[PDB]
Amino acid sequence: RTLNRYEKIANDIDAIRGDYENLSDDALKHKTIEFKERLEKGATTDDLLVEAFAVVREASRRVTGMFPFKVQLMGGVALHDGNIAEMKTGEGKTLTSTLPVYLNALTGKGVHVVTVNEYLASRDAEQMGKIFEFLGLTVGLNLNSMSKDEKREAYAADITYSTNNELGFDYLRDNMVLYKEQMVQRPLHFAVIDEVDSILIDEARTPLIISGQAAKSTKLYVQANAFVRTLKAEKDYTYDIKTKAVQLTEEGMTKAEKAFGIDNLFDVKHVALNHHINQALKAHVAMQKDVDYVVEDGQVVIVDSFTGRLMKGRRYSEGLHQAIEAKEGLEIQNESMTLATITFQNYFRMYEKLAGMTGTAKTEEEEFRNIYNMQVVTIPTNRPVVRDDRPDLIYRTMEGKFKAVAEDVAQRYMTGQPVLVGTVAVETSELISKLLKNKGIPHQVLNAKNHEREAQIIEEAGQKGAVTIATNMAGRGTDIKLGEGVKELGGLAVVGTERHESRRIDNQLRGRSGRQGDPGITQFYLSMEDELMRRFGAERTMAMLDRFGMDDSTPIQSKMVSRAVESSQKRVEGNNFDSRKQLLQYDDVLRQQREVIYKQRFEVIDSENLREIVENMIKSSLERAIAAYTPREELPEEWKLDGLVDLINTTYLDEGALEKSDIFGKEPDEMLELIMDRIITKYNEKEEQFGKEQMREFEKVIVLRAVDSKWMDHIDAMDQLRQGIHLRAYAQTNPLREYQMEGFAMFEHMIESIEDEVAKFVMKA
Amino acid sequence: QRVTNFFKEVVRELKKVSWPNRKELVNYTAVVLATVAFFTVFFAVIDLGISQLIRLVF
Amino acid sequence: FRTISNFMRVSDIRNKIIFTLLMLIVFRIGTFIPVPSVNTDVLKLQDCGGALQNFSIFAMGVMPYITASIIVQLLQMDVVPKFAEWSKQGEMGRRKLAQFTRYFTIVLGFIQALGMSYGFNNLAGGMLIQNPGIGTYLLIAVVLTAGTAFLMWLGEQITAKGVGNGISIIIFAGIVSGIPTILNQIYAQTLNIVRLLLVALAVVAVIVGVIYIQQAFRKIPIQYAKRLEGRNPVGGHSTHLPLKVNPAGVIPVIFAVSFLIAPPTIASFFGTNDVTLWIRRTFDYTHPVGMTIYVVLIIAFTYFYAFVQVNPEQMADNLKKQGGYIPGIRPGKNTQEYVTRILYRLTLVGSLFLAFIAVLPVFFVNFANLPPSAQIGGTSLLIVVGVALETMKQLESQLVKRHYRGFIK
Amino acid sequence: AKKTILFLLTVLTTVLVSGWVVLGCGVVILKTLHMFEVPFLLVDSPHSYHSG
Ligand SMILES: Nc1ncnc2c1ncn2[C@@H]1O[C@H](COP(=O)(O)OP(=O)(O)O)[C@@H](O)[C@H]1O
Ligand code: BEF
């Protein structure tokens, strides 16, 4: 077993703690100095482990008044080995991210502590930064609003606190620089990841895309808007609700053809008009206003699907954001164009040692073991969980559920107990807010649109008699500390309102109730016309829901609807599993290609003389131009060498240097040496003419511009191939092998294009 | 006459099929004949050796 | 060569081809391991007998798993609706269907082991199992179903850690292991050198014909109007929907031999008669009336199975369901009728090719006086060609994974 | 309905596998044993952080 090793090391840390207590301050900062000296001299980070953890415990007390328990030391040792410490939600997973961060921050290579959003990153960075800046290490905190100089000074600190989005985007913007000293990140060393399930399992379903803006279109967005707005919800389109997909019908296609003057909407001449009618249809009926975006000062701001926060830089792609902006009469902005792309799997798998801690990982041990080779270590709880965890209450309608949840928080407000209601949308939270305005209950609400007052809401949400309504914002890390006299009456009744897409997310909400041995009550109120049941519930049970009746004063007591609820949630888990797995293997293809190009682009950035790189590009393009003429199946003296002399004079040797008598039907090697010697003397003339240093800046600009433009075009061509791939599974093959073979052919055509562009731009200019 | 119209449509459809070229046909036939020859020789050698070993153990 | 040395040069590819050859050796030691409690018979003396099939562990082969798979695939098509919902739900339903195929094939291997044991007893005339009783027959039935279970686990092993699909490699191994005894009979016949050269050039010619028809796709163009397609096109690898010329596979021949040899089995289940003798003479496919009804059944079952496997209505609803459309064709019912017309013409060509392949060896045995255990090019030829090509393509995809060059070199 | 046809095909296949009870004297049954292969297995909104 591995657990008994961690208990033996935790007992060793207690033994050393026996001597570590009476050391004065300014004799512990010297202990960090001594640890760096011993780590430089001959030691590793394992031996120092025992001593280092004891040091942090003493430092922790003096800075914070919190002493680490023994299970926090077991979590620190399990995080140091590269494993996933599953400690229960509420059991202090922020001091156990202080022990191995200190131990692996001593060498100087730098530790990235990832969290889910910026409230938790700033929250952890202040307190743990007090602990670390006590001990003589630096702490940086990397946010979205920082300039590149402040980000470069944040990653130059010993410990960096950031979100996962900012780490991914700083990585992708490090490989779009023009100089080596514009990169912000250091070489990647050690990532501790708070809430590993949310980052590596949940939101690794989606990629990080960085896109610059192309030229604007506005005419067809407004035309497709004005068409789709008059379109008769059941007769001219069908909104599939199982997967949120909207299509026209035959009356809809006929009205689309008669409103635009075209004859067939499904030509190849009108792929653009059909694309605009499709995206205006999706933006009109499949996307609702306060659920998955907002309007904020004349702009559409999308609300994050996982965290429920405003993602104020991100925009919907494939022309959907402009269709939403045209839906509400806002100004339509320029179309994007993907520059760089990565996944959270392939980003967190370039990190040389990757750890993590979470509360709800034991469901996903096989996924943490297959993809990342990290094993979930389940760690004890130091105090038993006395959180009263009541079962669900299924109702028949949404208004019955909301009347019942308002009556529950009304009866809990009367005794002074704090309630935290938990929704997922920004409109159901204001629906229950207006259900609690009348009935006269003073509450607070933490939507996506109420992000500025979050700390003052969370500081008050555990006091005697405080009601909070909270979306996904306060459901993953929010630490509601109980007030005065509030533990005695069962502190922080958490009241759910729907079931989420996994068991881990609602186990996290119940975890907001619990909080290390303090009492708490959770309760989930459910409906049968929920979004989860409407989308994913099986078609068999709906007859029985008709059977149950209609008064909705009391919940359903049956095991049929409970089986339906759990089966629908397990279907959402299975769908997300499959989507995650196929995104993983298709970005494994694109990961091999991206690794090749990003490595070689970086080694043409910091190369002090890139003459040999450009010369190999000219030589490879030259031999491909030789073999593209003079075909080796054909016998010589028929090889149409006049076109070869024309092409070489147009592309390499200034229109006069090559004539047909110099080559005259040789074998390709000696004529290749002749053309290569004429190219190398023209290039050496240009090098001694231009200047040794200005030539390198010139051809660095040429090489980087060619690599960047052809790689953008390759990212977009690989996305269109990834669309057509399953149709290739119709003819009985598997489509992943077709994707790998087409991706390799397409990559090599791209690189031949890069070499041809660089050769003709260096030798004809 | 629908049947001769149908066979005219069948020959037009056979024009639209993407048949393999000459190079892929000789490469594939080399792979098929080489795999059958190798596995035939491999299974003959396996059968002879295992039968002789079984006869040696009796 | 170059590509074979390329396979040997890489360590991962050579590791998995060596693992595949090891598990094929493991499968091939089992063809000599006899069934216990049968061994005391004329099987050590039979040299009218089996002589091809003989006997062993894995006498079933993987044929219970083939029958289980084709039966549950025909049951998915609106016959047991539970299987339809399991297919429509996703990958968890695919695991449910795979475990159903495993328990279905244990059931089927059991009852076919009973059938084949009593049938080889009756072919031998009784005197092949000493003490013919319930306990020994149940023992050898559990033994043959254990053989099928070990072969299916072996196939899963060699598809997880070896070259290609496992069941296809094991079926191909059975066919090409049957080859050298046929070569032995062909040699021990010799009746000239010109007969061998003409029949071998005809064998290589029909191998080229099978490569030609098996690797031909009618590629319907598909236009997805859910992404911009803006200012980054080349035009080479556009999205398409490939239909094969032979979509059905080789399963038309299993339905045709079932419908051909079931009435002689019924008529011999009854016993000898005059109309029984007429049926047994009529439904032999070495005769022109039987061969005509064999060819008609192959064509009819090729049409039925090509419309089961491609399913134009379900693929048109599947194309409307996510964006795509054929350029020109309105994506509801008109896409279904367009791809149905393409399927009618393409399946006519593929069905005629299948019928000419399946009755080729009786023409070869008549017009080329081979020993009649040869069957040079039945559907064994199609299985051999298919498995050899897809194992080669899987190894080629691993090679192109290892070839990423870069512009610097 | 096509259900009857599907059922008929399944029953015929079952009869063929379990009708190995009389082997002549089989000139088709061993052929049937070695000559068939397995069938082939049957067939939201993306975002982008605009910076550069
Ligand atoms: N050694 C300790 N002594 C007392 N309180 C502690 C100790 N360690 C952690 N805590 C408290 O437990 C609470 C749990 O909060 P947090 O660390 O956010 O939970 P988690 O580790 O689940 O994220 C914190 O408020 C912290 O004050
Ligand atoms: F990582 Be914690 F439960 F704030």
Q: Are residue A221 and residue A107 in the same domain, yes or no?
A: no
Within C77-231, where are the H helices? 81-89, 91-123, 134-161, 166-189, 194-214
The residue range of the domain holding B2 is 1-56
CATH number at A366 reads 3.40.50.300
Q: Are residue A326 and residue A429 in the same domain, yes or no?
A: no
Coil/strand/helix, residue A84? strand
Q: Are C319 and C331 a contacting pair, CB within 8 Å?
A: yes
> Of C310, C302, C314, nearest to C347 (Cα)?
C302
Q: Which residues contact A328 (CB under 8 A, 6 or more apart)?
A: A289, A295, A300
Q: Which amino acid is at A714?
A: H
Residue A622 CA, ligand 1 centroid: distance in Å:
66
Binding residues of A for ATP: 66-67, 72, 90-94, 479
Strands C240-244 and C217-221: antiparallel
Handedness of CA A568, A573, A578, A583 (dihedral sign): positive
For chain C, domain boundaries: 1-181, 192-368
Coil/strand/helix, residue A260? coil
Task: Compute, in degrees rounded to 10, the torsion defined by CA atoms C64, C67, C68, C72.
Answer: 180
Q: Are residue A311 and residue A340 in the same domain, yes or no?
A: yes
Integer Cα distance of C352 and C340 in angstroms: 18
Q: How many domains does chain A have?
A: 4
Measured in residues, chain A has a length of: 765
Interface membership of C204 toward B (CB under 8 Å): yes
Place of tokens 């004065």: A24
Partners of A525 in beta bridges: A393
Q: Are C92 and D34 a contacting pair, CB within 8 Å?
A: no
In a domain, A723, yes or no: yes
- DSSP assigned state of A188: P
Coil/strand/helix, residue C396? helix
Integer Cα distance of A410 and A399 in angstroms: 16
Integer Cα distance of A350 and A185 in angstroms: 13
Interface test with C, best of D23, D25, D40, D47 (most C CBs within 10 A): D23
CATH number of C1-181: 1.10.3370.10
In a domain, A644, yes or no: yes
Q: Are C301 and C249 a contacting pair, CB within 8 Å?
A: no
Coil/strand/helix, residue A527? strand
> Of C169, C57, C148, C159, nearest to C104 (Cα)?
C148
Integer Cα distance of A658 and A644 in angstroms: 10
Coil/strand/helix, residue A414? coil
Q: Are C260 and C266 a contacting pair, CB within 8 Å?
A: no
Q: Are residue A205 and residue A240 in the same domain, yes or no?
A: no
Binding residues of A: 66-67, 72, 90-94, 479
> Of A706, A715, A694, nearest to A593 (Cα)?
A715
Report, in angstroms and rounded to the nearest whole number, the Rg of chain B calculated over CA atoms. 24
Separation in Å, CA A731 to CA A75, A762, C339: 51, 46, 14
Integer Cα distance of C64 and A7 in angstroms: 53
Integer Cα distance of C85 and C92 in angstroms: 11
CA distance A737 to chain C (A): 6
The encoded tokens of residue C138 equal 């149940």
Integer Cα distance of D36 and A722 in angstroms: 34
Integer Cα distance of A653 and A642 in angstroms: 15
Nearest to C215 among B14, B20, B36 (CB): B20
Q: Which residues contact A498 (CB under 8 A, 6 or more apart)?
A: A423, A424, A524, A526, A527, A530, A531, A532
In a domain, A577, yes or no: no
- Show residues of chain B in contact with C211, CB under 8 Å: 20, 25, 28-29, 32
Q: Which amino acid is at C20?
A: T
Handedness of CA C243, C244, C250, C255 (dihedral sign): positive
Interchain CB distance below 8 Å, C180 and B32: no
Interchain CB distance below 8 Å, B54 and C348: no
Half-sphere exposure of C221 (CA within 13 A, CB side): 13
Interface test with D, best of C76, C261, C365 (most D CBs within 10 A): C261
Sheet arrangement for strand A139-141: A139-141, A159-163, A111-115, A190-193
Greatest alpha-carbon span in chain D = 83
- Spacing of C-alpha A105 from chain mean position: 25
The encoded tokens of residue A383 equal 């105090």
Integer Cα distance of C378 and A78 in angstroms: 62
Within C190-324, where are the H helices? 194-214, 251-270, 275-282, 288-309, 312-321
CA distance B52 to chain C (A): 12
Helices and strands (H, E) in chain A, number of each type: 28, 22
- Spacing of C-alpha A251 from chain mean position: 41
Place of tokens 């179309």: A335
Separation in Å, CA C223 to CA A220, C228, C324: 20, 11, 5
Coil/strand/helix, residue C355? helix
> Of A273, A259, A257, A250, nearest to A230 (Cα)?
A259
Q: In degrees rounded to 5, what are phi and psi of residue A208?
A: -90, 120
Interchain CB distance below 8 Å, C28 and B33: no
Integer Cα distance of A199 and A166 in angstroms: 13
Q: Are residue A468 and residue A368 in the same domain, yes or no?
A: no
Coil/strand/helix, residue A315? strand
The packing angle between helices A559-605 and A735-763, to 10°, is 20
Q: Are residue A131 and residue A216 in the same domain, yes or no?
A: no
In a domain, A553, yes or no: yes
> Of A247, A178, A166, nearest to A208 (Cα)?
A166
Coil/strand/helix, residue C201? helix
Q: Which residues contact A410 (CB under 8 A, 6 or more apart)?
A: A436, A439, A441
Q: Tabulate helix, strand, coil % of chain C (nearest 5).
A: 65, 5, 30
In a domain, A108, yes or no: yes
Half-sphere exposure of A549 (CA within 13 A, CB side): 8
Q: Are residue A611 and residue A478 in the same domain, yes or no?
A: no
In a domain, A580, yes or no: no
Integer Cα distance of A21 and A738 in angstroms: 64
DSSP letters for C250-261: THHHHHHHHHHH
Q: For residue A64, give the ligand 1 atom closest to its CA.
A: 27
Q: Are C192 and C377 a contacting pair, CB within 8 Å?
A: no
Cβ atoms within 10 A of the Cβ of C237, count? 17
Q: Are B49 and C28 a contacting pair, CB within 8 Å?
A: no
The ligand whose atoms approach the alpha carbon of A57 most closely is 1
Q: Are residue A685 and residue A720 in the same domain, yes or no?
A: yes
Please tell me the experimental approach by which this structure was elucidated: cryo-EM
- DSSP assigned state of C232: -
> ∠ CA(A236), CA(A239), CA(A243), 5° rounding?
155
Q: How many domains does chain B have?
A: 1
Q: Which helix (H) or strand (E) holds D6?
A: helix D3-18
The residue range of the domain holding A618 is 590-764
Q: Tabulate helix, strand, coil % of chain A (nearest 5).
A: 50, 10, 35
Half-sphere exposure of A85 (CA within 13 A, CB side): 33
CATH number at A298 reads 3.90.1440.10
Q: Residue A477: CB within 6 Å of ligand 2?
A: yes
Nearest to B31 among C208, C346, C389 (CB): C389
Cα end-to-end span (Å), chain D: 60
Q: Are residue A28 and residue A164 in the same domain, yes or no?
A: yes
DSSP letters for A435-470: HHHTTT--EEEE-STT-TTHHHHHTTTTSTT-EEEE
Strands A207-213 and A336-343: antiparallel
- List, as own/partner pairs, every contact residues A592-601 make where C-beta atoms lie below 8 angstroms and the sequence separation is at least 24, other chains included: A592/C401, A592/C404, A593/A714, A593/A718, A593/A743, A593/A747, A593/C404, A594/A341, A594/A342, A596/C404, A596/C405, A596/C406, A597/A707, A597/A711, A597/C406, A598/A175, A599/C406, A600/C406, A600/C407, A600/C408, A601/A175, A601/A704, A601/A707
Burial class (CB in 10 A: 0-12, 13-18, 19+), A235: exposed
Q: Which helix (H) or strand (E) holds A161?
A: strand A159-163
CATH number of C192-368: 1.10.3370.10
Q: Residue A93: CB within 6 Å of ligand 2?
A: yes
Cβ atoms within 10 A of the Cβ of C113, count? 25
Integer Cα distance of C250 and C302 in angstroms: 9
Integer Cα distance of A336 and A213 in angstroms: 4
Q: Are residue A30 and residue A83 in the same domain, yes or no?
A: yes
> Of A73, A158, A77, A144, nearest to A111 (Cα)?
A158
Which residues does ligand 1 sit against, CB inside 6 Å?
Answer: A 66-69, 89-95, 479, 481, 516
Q: Are residue A50 and residue A112 in the same domain, yes or no?
A: yes
- Show residues of chain D in contact with C78, CB under 8 Å: 2-3, 6
Pick the residue whose CA is nearest to atom 8 on ligand 1: A92
Separation in Å, CA A104 to CA A159, A314, A368: 10, 34, 22
Strands A294-295 and A300-303: antiparallel
Pick the residue whose CA is nearest to atom 1 on ligand 2: A93
> ∠ CA(C324), CA(C327), CA(C329), 5° rounding?
90
Interface of D with A in 1-52 (CB under 8 A): 40, 43-52
Q: Which helix (H) or strand (E) holds C240?
A: strand C240-244
CATH number at A726 reads 1.10.3060.10
CA distance A576 to chain D (A): 12
Integer Cα distance of A155 and A170 in angstroms: 10
Place of tokens 């993407």: B18
